[PDB]
Design a binder for this molecule. Sequence first.
Ligand SMILES: Nc1ncnc2c1ncn2[C@@H]1O[C@H](COP(=O)(O)OP(=O)(O)O)[C@@H](O)[C@H]1O
Ligand SMILES: C[C@@H](C[P@@](=O)(OP(=O)(O)O)[C@@H](C)N)C(=O)O
Ligand SMILES: [Mg+2]
Ligand SMILES: [Mg+2]
Lengths: 347, 360
Amino acid sequence: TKKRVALIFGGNSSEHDVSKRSAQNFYNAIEATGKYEIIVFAIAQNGFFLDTESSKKILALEDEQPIVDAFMKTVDASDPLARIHALKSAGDFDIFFPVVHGNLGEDGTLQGLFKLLDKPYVGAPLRGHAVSFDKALTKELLTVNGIRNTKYIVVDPESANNWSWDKIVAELGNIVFVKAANQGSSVGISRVTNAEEYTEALSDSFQYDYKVLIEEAVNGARELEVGVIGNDQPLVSEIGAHTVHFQIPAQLSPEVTKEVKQMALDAYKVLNLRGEARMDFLLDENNVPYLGEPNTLPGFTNMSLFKRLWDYSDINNAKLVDMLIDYGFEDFAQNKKLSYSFVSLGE
Amino acid sequence: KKRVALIFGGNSSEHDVSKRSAQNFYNAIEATGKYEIIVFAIAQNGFFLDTESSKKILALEDEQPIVDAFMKTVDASDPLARIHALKSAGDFDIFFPVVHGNLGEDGTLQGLFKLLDKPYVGAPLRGHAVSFDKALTKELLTVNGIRNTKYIVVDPESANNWSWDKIVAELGNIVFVKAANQGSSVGISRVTNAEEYTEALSDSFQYDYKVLIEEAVNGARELEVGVIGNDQPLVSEIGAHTVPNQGSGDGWYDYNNKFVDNSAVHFQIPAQLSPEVTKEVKQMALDAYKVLNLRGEARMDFLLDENNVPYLGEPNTLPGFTNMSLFKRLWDYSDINNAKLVDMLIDYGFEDFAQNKKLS
Ligand SMILES: Nc1ncnc2c1ncn2[C@@H]1O[C@H](COP(=O)(O)OP(=O)(O)O)[C@@H](O)[C@H]1O
Ligand SMILES: C[C@@H](C[P@@](=O)(OP(=O)(O)O)[C@@H](C)N)C(=O)O
Ligand SMILES: [Mg+2]
Ligand SMILES: [Mg+2]
């Protein structure tokens, strides 16, 4: 109605399609408040930003490739800023609302661009996304801070050489997970139980990153996911447990519930997160909760957990997205007080 | 033939230092004779300036007049106005960031480099991000067994729980208070009493909402070591420097001793150390590089206690390159002068960009 929101979706990842679905439910939520004007932008799998008109169609779920191909013919290959030129195609706006799942929205890249343009945005700062995205970086901060998670080892092409399977077993056990540090959703992940699987797991993971993480596996089969939103004073959702069949509120003992919610809160702060996040846990056979991977940009599709978690806290989609936008505006205001002055130099 | 986008300046507390480092890097690249250079300045308002207004700023001409002039040609309706100047000279092949502080060492510029999909010299986004936050750095070092000072991290609310008596009992009567995300010794204070403590908390909290309070190492001198490369990084010789009344007094390497007046500090290359310590610092530097996720270039600084025990002070992802900067001299002792230095740094940048394409 006045304030303009730039809703960005898409991304050069394997989760390109899931992004479109999340973007739609966010759009409807922002629209349902009647306070802002939405301007949508899409990022094709080739990294290029698309104009508002082309992206409006892609959001509607129309065949994407023809739309992209047509756009690529209007691009000037001699412009070093061509990949982001389409961002001005619809004029000035007030705040970015990122919903790009994968290697652009969760690793901190887009957030760098947002700061350079001195414009507000929703979600965590670039540092927060960067630490939450890097598998190794996440475990190191959580461990030094006392938040329970599995035992692990970080290797590279050369160090991996000092780690025979027998040594890995002495440290982590006979059942481990090998994986590329920076990579998302799938590839580079392996379930190792013996020396044969380990040798080939390293070769595989070393194709997606030069830094591999090896961690022991939790025996228990009970996934827990909790949402957290806010800045200086975070809110924690109810717990969703596995009984894609999520049970809410999770049926755990009063003690396990408060412990899992506290870990989610403590983790959010040590990981330097802001705005929104989903904390995924693993509960073993003795009801001991282990914080797994943090999610800086959760899915908002019809079937994803974050789409209905806040309903159990009386926060509907409209209120939720409105809170996310207020937090974004607030943090920009706080960072505006910070000084970057200095005593002028000379000869 | 290849074009190099030398960027400097930025809205940062180390804005003027960047100027000095920039001219030097320019001359070094020019000396190789294999690259063309396009200079880009970023004013204090965060606006990139055209290649012409910038060449003048590099030549040391007054900034403001040249900036104001430029600001009258800006389209204030364009959301991409701050970075529009980047196209004001055509296409280039690689980025060479020389902006110290707030934009180059925190990951911001590296975010843009990834979007335009061009190679670049220096560490990746996560490296700078993790290396600039003083608290995140010391956290990654501690969990890896890399020696660093005892400290506590607080925010404006958390700060009121630590009264002076509580601090003295936890870290001793001489402590250093600093803003987590800063450089060149700005936002940092040497604290010895209750009034200086509280005055310093206020001073630090005007540069960041996160400050560190760490115990002071009574050592008479500091150490610096350069490290470059990607998957198989090299380590330079250790360099040293000491300010008047450092150990046997209150003197320290503040903003005034580094850039205002440096004609009173003593430097040693290589540093006078035992074979043991020399080996220990070179390995700590190497280890910290990997942990911190750095690439291309860096400089590791150390604190030395009375008994000569080394403490990893802090990493610097885009180290200074001025006429009193150690990163401009150290590599000469490894048969790598300023020329071969930047040629290697540029090759590293291209090699990592190429390697990155395959890893997908
Ligand atoms: N814990 C400490 N013990 C002794 N001296 C310190 C300590 N911390 C900082 N200093 C002094 O203050 C200066 C600040 O350095 P540093 O912490 O690396 O910050 P900056 O980013 O400003 O270089 C150092 O060069 C050193 O002389
Ligand atoms: C004295 C030193 C400064 P600097 O490189 O390092 P510090 O952050 O420790 O000041 C700084 C520019 N970031 C030099 O130029 O080499
Ligand atoms: Mg520094
Ligand atoms: Mg220093």
